[PDB]
Amino acid sequence: MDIPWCDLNIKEKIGAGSFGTVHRAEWHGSDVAVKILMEQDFHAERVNEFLREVAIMKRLRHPNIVLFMGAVTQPPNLSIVTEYLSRGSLYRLLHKSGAREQLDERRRLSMAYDVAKGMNYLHNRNPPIVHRNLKSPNLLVDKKYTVKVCDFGTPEWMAPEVLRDEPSNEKSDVYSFGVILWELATLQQPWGNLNPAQVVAAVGFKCKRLEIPRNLNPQVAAIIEGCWTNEPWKRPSFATIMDLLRPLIK
Numbered sequence: 001m002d003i004p005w006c007d008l009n010i011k012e013k014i015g016a017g018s019f020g021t022v023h024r025a026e027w028h029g030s031d032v033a034v035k036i037l038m039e040q041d042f043h044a045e046r047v048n049e050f051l052r053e054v055a056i057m058k059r060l061r062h063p064n065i066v067l068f069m070g071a072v073t074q075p076p077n078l079s080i081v082t083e084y085l086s087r088g089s090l091y092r093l094l095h096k097s098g099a100r101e102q103l104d105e106r107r108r109l110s111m112a113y114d115v116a117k118g119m120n121y122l123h124n125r126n127p128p129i130v131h132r133n134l135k136s137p138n139l140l141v142d143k144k145y146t147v148k149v150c151d152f153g154t155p156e157w158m159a160p161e162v163l164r165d166e167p168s169n170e171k172s173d174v175y176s177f178g179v180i181l182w183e184l185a186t187l188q189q190p191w192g193n194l195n196p197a198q199v200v201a202a203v204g205f206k207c208k209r210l211e212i213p214r215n216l217n218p219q220v221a222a223i224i225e226g227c228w229t230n231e232p233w234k235r236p237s238f239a240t241i242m243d244l245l246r247p248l249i250k
Helices: 044-059 090-095 105-123 172-186 196-205 218-227 238-249
Strands: 008-016 020-027 030-037 068-072 079-083 139-141 147-149
Touching: 008 030, 044 068, 090 139, 090 172, 105 147, 105 172, 105 238, 172 218, 172 238, 218 238
Parallel strands: none
Antiparallel strands: 008 020, 020 030, 030 079, 068 079, 139 147
16 A cells, blocks of 8 residues: 555664665554665656565565565655564574573474465465575564565575576575574574685585584474585475474474
8 A cells, every 4th residue: 555755753773775774663553664765766767666566565465474564655755664573683683692592492493484484475476486585684573483584695595506696596595494494493603604705615616515513403404404405406395394394393
């Protein structure tokens, strides 16, 4: 639904990027998040691309996808309005201090399941929607620790083929999921000891893979390893990942 800029009461900034910034906001009493595009080119081609993007978001409806709630479609305030997740990015949540005590194995496995559900949903659109930029910093977490894929750089989550500048693949983000599941199970930062360029070489050309603790749950380790096969088409679909994760959380 269309939203007039004046109807938004902007609050404290909660994020930012290339597009611009993100701010919590009050909207007719409702608590929302507003993505404010700062670019000052309001010519048709751009406004139209924006409108086109907004029409896509309107069609994406799933519990584990950030809830679209509206859009400011009038210059000079092009914006996307969504629900507000108060715990922010998954990345910061895992690496903040005390995370291990704050989040038990069962919870972190549920968080993984949430992502798999979102991605399974996205992969089943016609045409399928592939998120090659899938990564923990892109995932958002609400108060109840539910995780949602934010659908609207650095390569530690990019699949080898992507790092090789190869053609787009539907199973590229399955590799990325493998890294996210690894972060969740180990609470380690991926490739913390390499610079971006070294990551590209390691995973893209030397078939290096993040090390799995011998101490880790075998069933979770298996899910991870399967996501990391060099042959993309050999990686399990997200629905298969869901089947494999469901026994564990329960």
